[PDB]
RNA sequence: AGGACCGAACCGACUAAUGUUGAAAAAUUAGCGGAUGACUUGUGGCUGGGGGUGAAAGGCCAAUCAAACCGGGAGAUAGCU
RNA sequence: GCUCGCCGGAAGACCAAGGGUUCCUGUCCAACGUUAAUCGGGGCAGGGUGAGUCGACCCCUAAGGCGAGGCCGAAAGGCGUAGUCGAUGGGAAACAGGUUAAUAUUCCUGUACUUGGUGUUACUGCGAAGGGGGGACGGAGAAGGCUAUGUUGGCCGGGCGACGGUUGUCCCGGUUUAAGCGUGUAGGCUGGUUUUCCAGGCAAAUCCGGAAAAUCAAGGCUGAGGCGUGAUGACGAGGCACUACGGUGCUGAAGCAACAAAUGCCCUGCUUCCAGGAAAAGCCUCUAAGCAUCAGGUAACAUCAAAUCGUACCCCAAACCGACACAGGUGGUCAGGUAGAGAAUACCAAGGCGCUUGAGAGAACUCGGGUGAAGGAACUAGGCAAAAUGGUGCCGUAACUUCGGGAGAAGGCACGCUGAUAUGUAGGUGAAGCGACUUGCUCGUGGAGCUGAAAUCAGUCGAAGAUACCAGCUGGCUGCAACUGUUUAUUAAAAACACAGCACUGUGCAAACACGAAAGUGGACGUAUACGGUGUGACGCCUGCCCGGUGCCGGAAGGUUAAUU
């Protein structure tokens, strides 16, 4: 059967990528929390 | 005109392998692990000056460094005209 | 002419179509076309603001001259064309200086006819004049509401407006609704009625024929659950309530016009 | 010509059996319905939680839905166990 | 290695997406792999991806996103103009052979093509974020002309048969060749060429549009395929050598015709229909400001430049999504033979596989099948399940009906092979020849050769001839919903929802109404034959009485009645 994850790099980057996080202040707050936690990977950008 | 210093930094290691020797013996194609930013023009001029030979064309490819070690490098297939290089 | 299709299948049994052999068969006039992308009834917030809109056939917009500003130059009618953006059909007119335009086709118009606009134009169907220069009692269409704005009233297929009185700077019109209205006498109008009056006689015949006009199915309020509509649930078919819109306003009688800015121009409301 | 007909792909899902610590957190097998249309599909986009979307079933909105998920108020409160 | 089975519109081949080195070689067998493993998509080492023409980038735009100013909104921020991004779409050019252990339109061989820069020469009006062309567009249907491709014949090479026969209407194999360049024909579209004039194309134009006049319609665009050349080249059945028997090296015949052919091409065509079918740039053309013996434009030649990134491998799957080497899911391209209407189905080709535990035995019972005497729905909640029917042609076919249907109604009959009609018919194709011409990619005439149903008559075989696979059960009486459709992803497909039609009601456009503190936007670039909301639900015949009550609409004389004063 069809499962929920149907990957697509373009959609992934447009939805959760670095430039998408930086576009709004809430997304910029997501990045600040992840920097405070010390995450090795900030975003899905690769 | 590309500067000499730039040309000195495009040539890193003469690639030695089975396919390397095969190409050199067949179409006089010297193979060289060059810099990953070295453009065709850069490699051509560098080999024609530092190795002082004649280059027909460069057929460079970027080799994806295998994980757990190798970093990403560039294999230039510097086809020479008749100038015997390495 | 209205034609009944033979019942060679259900979905054809009750189809009545209005075929017009005078309508041009080729492509429309390219310089007068633009793209018209569909909306689905969604605004710039992306939300459905008008229900039951979506799909249908792709359509190109034809720029129709509603102002009729080219005064004093005669025009001849080249052909009648089908227009998918309205119930009426349009006419391609060639002005004597060599410029073409689209107008709403009046009732009796046909290829070869001569039309003209301005103060001194003759009183014939298809001619556009200020209503100051049109005899009282005339039947006109594509009527301006403000001088120079362009025609707004009586634009549908078989519609027309009657000039019933002229009192100073205003004329009184009888609208298709039956409403009596006042407009400035400097507003323009076109003599005659809009053609294609057989439009109202067509029968779609099947559900799909409405789907490809861009109309989506209407679900009755009483068929939903109470969370979705004031006509809520019930075990079986229950109503027990006064009819209302999905947002709770009493339909079936309650008047909704509230415009004090305009009330001065309504001589009589429709009945 | 046809929301025509029969019937592969395709899209579905009426019945029976099997499976029920499954080959599978809904499938397999045998049949079954539509199959030029209110058709199906690829790729992008858009609508956000008392909100969306709904040919309307309280359906669906990432195996979650008569109010998603995550984190916070928070050690809510619990005459009950 | 030899047999055997299995897929074959796939279980073959090539990709996109996604993955990420899984790819090739050498080594190892702890763990991994539902067993062993000497093997592996496992471990370790080393290699492997070569592009002016393929793709991306790039140019251009759709939906949509963002958005200087700007307009709004306690703040955060919303919307949006100029603009700028954004493919799933439009913009330039390479083919065939050969080669690696693993890369090829990328390397090599041969033969091409495109765009741009810069010089020389010759001739010259050039010049926009501006005008006009063009790009540029739906569904359905029907030819006709072709090709891919196939079959047979001819040709060439080989063969003469483990068992009766096999020097022949015998057997096996091969009979390939491209981009480009030249020609321009089956077809499609359109009258052409001059001259004069102008209320149009935000200005002006020699371009587009319009109006007259003259004179020839005999012109031009477009266009598959064929033919020529590429190419005396390459490839080529097989032979002859070396050999590590892997495999490498050398040489190399014929390389034609007829018929049948697509869902591919002509065709973005043609005919019809209503539901009336993107945009912008590249491209062509016109001028403005401006430039003036410059600069620019056109053509020829020469020369140079075409960067950067991707290229391995899987890709209906053991490499992607499903926790698994999971009976599931997953878009595009290609598609050979014999039967067949077929991309169904059976069996095969090319290729690819036997599904990572096996060996015995031959109990009950379970699963998945085959067949059954006599009965024949007695079963059961119910024919659930099974069994049955099943093709083509012809004959024949009731009630009822909205005249279309019902209807494959029902029910019958003939089907194989052989021979003759006719050493292969009707039909299809069509060569030479023969004439013609406005003389070759021409047109008639002629019928060689090839292909080829269907029928009738006669005969013959089995129990059976639509012999397999494939492939309607039928009829009678009723409830409901008109109908095709839609739904409770994962126990409900229905009489439910939708529906065409009907009615009511609201709405005069800055519409009602909706999403929005707002700004705005949808409705709608629509405008009362238009839109919204409600109920009913094709069609036919129809829809009675009641305004008490509760809404809604109208009226307002009087009573009561807020802030305020």
Residue numbers in the entry:
A (entry chain 6): 1 to 46
B (entry chain t): 1 to 86
C (entry chain c): 2 to 272
From the primary publication:
Co-translational folding is a fundamental process for the efficient biosynthesis of nascent polypeptides that emerge through the ribosome exit tunnel. To understand how this process is modulated by the shape and surface of the narrow tunnel, we have rationally engineered three exit tunnel protein loops (uL22, uL23 and uL24) of the 70S ribosome by CRISPR/Cas9 gene editing, and studied the co-translational folding of an immunoglobulin-like filamin domain (FLN5). In E.coli’s 70S ribosomal particle, the tunnel’s unique geometry is shaped by the 23S ribosomal RNA (rRNA) and the ribosomal proteins uL4, uL22, uL23, uL24 and uL29.
Within the wider vestibule region, the uL23 and uL24 loops were shortened to lengths consistent with those present in eukaryotic ribosomes with 7 and 11-residue deletions made within the uL23 (23ΔL) and uL24 (24ΔL) loops, respectively. To further explore a molecular basis for the observed earlier folding mediated by the shortened uL23 and uL24 loops, we used 15N-labelled RNC (L = 37) samples to derive structures of 23ΔL24ΔL 70S ribosomes using single-particle cryo-EM. The 23ΔL24ΔL RNCs were resolved to an average resolution of 2.75 Å, where the truncated uL23 loop is observed at high-resolution (local resolution 3–4 Å at 3σ) relative to the uL24 (local resolution >4 Å, at 1.8σ), which is decidedly more dynamic. There were no other significant structural differences in these ribosomes relative to the WT 70S ribosome, suggesting that the loop modifications only altered the local environment surrounding the site of mutation. The structures of truncated loops in the empty 70S ribosome were identical to those observed in the FLN5 RNC.
